[PDB]
Amino acid sequence: ERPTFYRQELNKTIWEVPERYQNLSPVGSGAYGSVCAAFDTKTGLRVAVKKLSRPFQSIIHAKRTYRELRLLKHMKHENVIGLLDVFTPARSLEEFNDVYLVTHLMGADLNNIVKCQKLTDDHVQFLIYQILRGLKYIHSADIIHRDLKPSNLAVNEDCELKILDFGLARHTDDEMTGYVATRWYRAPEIMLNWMHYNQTVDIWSVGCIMAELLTGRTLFPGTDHIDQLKLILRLVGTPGAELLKKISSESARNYIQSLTQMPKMNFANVFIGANPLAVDLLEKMLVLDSDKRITAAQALAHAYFAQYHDPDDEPVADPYDQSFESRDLLIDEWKSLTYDEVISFVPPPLD
Ligand SMILES: CC(C)(C)c1cc(NC(=O)Nc2ccc(Cl)c(COc3cccnc3)c2)[nH]n1
């Protein structure tokens, strides 16, 4: 039944893991946990193991922990990250305090690819294709990523691509401040809090990512929130009256109307030399009104992806029950909910 655990300290943190996992080596940490690379001897895999940092600190924390576990137990798709394993050294609910998550070891992110390599149009096709493929899956489970950027995309030597979230820290006001990649890929409505937002926020990010794969340059490297809004409105144009009504923040609405009105730019004169089909796709992604952005599913059928598109191999997620998001529970209740999910986990099969 239960495997044997051994202990070791790595960077003032104690790790207790099953013997199967060997050669633990620290790779990163933050307020929400620490990660080691390791070798899983039962599967033959290089794996990553995250140890959650006091997962049941507060109500809000415990619920956060439950949420990621549920989330990761559910993601089963080639272009999305999955759970290899999840474990606890705890022998009963009474002593459950620590949670460990196991995933495939990710090496290079997409930020490393565009930085250190020249990409062909065909490269960009395959890379964006896979993001959209994964995103169709994620969205069909009513999950929004909200933080799509190159660094949250893992890419191996064959340009095969997985969406995940490496994030280990709080998403605070300070990290979104200033000249920071954290904010360059954010949909404007979620950056200036215009309104209740939706799936299409992630599509805007793909817009920004695709542009950067084509040029090798950040699309909207704002020096701050407002500077970035100007860079954005310079390209796609200031909003019309139709879009202004949909902006719930009267204060935000009011700021936008103080701007000099500008037309949408010619994208062929921005993305000089790009495939006309890439240009067209960007025009349908980088749309200010989120009601009117192309969806992941719609985007898969666009002629830019003709080499790769296969409507029989672009699967959707099983129904995902997200009713817990509405419930207010106590720490011990989130905790036990989490514990059930730990003990019920069934590992994936390798072929
Ligand atoms: C929207 C999607 C489904 C993409 C999403 C994913 C997440 N969160 C995570 O992916 N979390 C997570 C948890 C544990 C581990 Cl081990 C990892 C991968 O971490 C590494 C670190 C270093 C090298 N390789 C993998 C991710 N939220 N939303």
Q: What is the CA radius of gyration of the chain?
A: 22
Check whether residue 84 and residue 162 sit in a common domain: no
Mutate to test the pocket of ligand 1, among 45, 47, 53, 72 (most ligand atoms within 8 A of CB): 72
Query: Which residues are identified as catalytic?
Result: 165
Q: Is 329 in the pocket of ligand 1 (CB under 6 A)?
A: no
Read off the tokens for 341: 């999910």
Check whether residue 224 and residue 303 sit in a common domain: yes
Check whether residue 186 and residue 68 sit in a common domain: no
In order, the DSSP letters of 161-211 are EEE-----S---TTTTSSS-HHHHTS-HHHHTT-S---THHHHHHHHHHHH
CA distance 244 to 255: 11
Check whether residue 197 and residue 52 sit in a common domain: no
Range of the domain at 244: 108-316
Q: Is 48 in the pocket of ligand 1 (CB under 6 A)?
A: yes
Domain annotation covers residue 7: no
Report residue 66: phi and psi, to 5°: -50, -40
CA distance 197 to 223: 24
Question: 245: Cβ–Cβ under 8 A, 6 or more apart, which residues?
Answer: none
Q: Is 336 annotated as a binding residue?
A: no
Task: Please tell me the residue having the least CA distance from ligand 1 atom 9.
Answer: 165
Check whether residue 64 and residue 81 sit in a common domain: yes
Question: 84: Cβ–Cβ under 8 A, 6 or more apart, which residues?
Answer: 40, 43, 45, 47, 102, 103, 104, 347, 348
Question: 136: Cβ–Cβ under 8 A, 6 or more apart, which residues?
Answer: 296, 297, 300, 314, 316
Q: How many domains does the chain have?
A: 2
Q: Is 50 annotated as a binding residue?
A: yes
Alpha carbon of 18 to those of 87, 89, 152: distances in Å?
8, 8, 28
End-to-end Cα spacing for the chain: 24
CA distance 274 to 304: 12
Read off the tokens for 340: 């059930």
Check whether residue 81 and residue 191 sit in a common domain: no
Check whether residue 120 and residue 249 sit in a common domain: yes
Check whether residue 103 and residue 120 sit in a common domain: no
> Residue 283: is it exposed, middle or buried by C-beta count within 10 angstroms (0-12/13-18/19+)?
middle
Total residues found in the chain within this entry? 351
Question: 104: Cβ–Cβ under 8 A, 6 or more apart, which residues?
Answer: 45, 46, 47, 48, 81, 82, 84, 162
Read off the tokens for 26: 């620290």
Domain annotation covers residue 351: no
Closest CA to 251 of 196, 183, 197, 192: 192
Q: Is 240 annotated as a binding residue?
A: no
Check whether residue 131 and residue 264 sit in a common domain: yes
CA distance 335 to 224: 39
Resolution, given in Å to one decimal, reads 2.4
Closest CA to 75 of 138, 117, 19, 150: 138
Question: Which CATH number goes with the domain that contains 308?
Answer: 1.10.510.10
Closest CA to 127 of 138, 117, 139: 117
CA distance 190 to 176: 12
Read off the tokens for 320: 């995902």
Task: Please tell me the residue having the least CA distance from ligand 1 atom 8.
Answer: 165
Between the CA of 58 and the centroid of ligand 1 the distance, in Å, is 22
Q: Determine the residue type at 205.
A: S
Contact (Cβ atoms closer than 8 angstroms) between residue 127 and residue 110 = yes
Q: Is 294 in the pocket of ligand 1 (CB under 6 A)?
A: no
Question: Which CATH number goes with the domain that contains 84?
Answer: 3.30.200.20
Select from 84, 107, 130 the last residue of a domain: 107
Question: Alpha-carbon torsion 223, 227, 230, 234, what sign?
Answer: negative
In order, the DSSP letters of 314-335 are -PPPPP---GGGG----HHHHH
CA distance 328 to 36: 33
Report residue 217: phi and psi, to 5°: -135, 150
Select from 107, 126, 143 the last residue of a domain: 107
What is the helix (H) or strand (E) element at residue 241, kind and residue range?
Answer: helix 241-245
Select from 54, 74, 107 the last residue of a domain: 107
Check whether residue 70 and residue 132 sit in a common domain: no
Q: Is 145 in the pocket of ligand 1 (CB under 6 A)?
A: yes
Q: Is 75 in the pocket of ligand 1 (CB under 6 A)?
A: yes
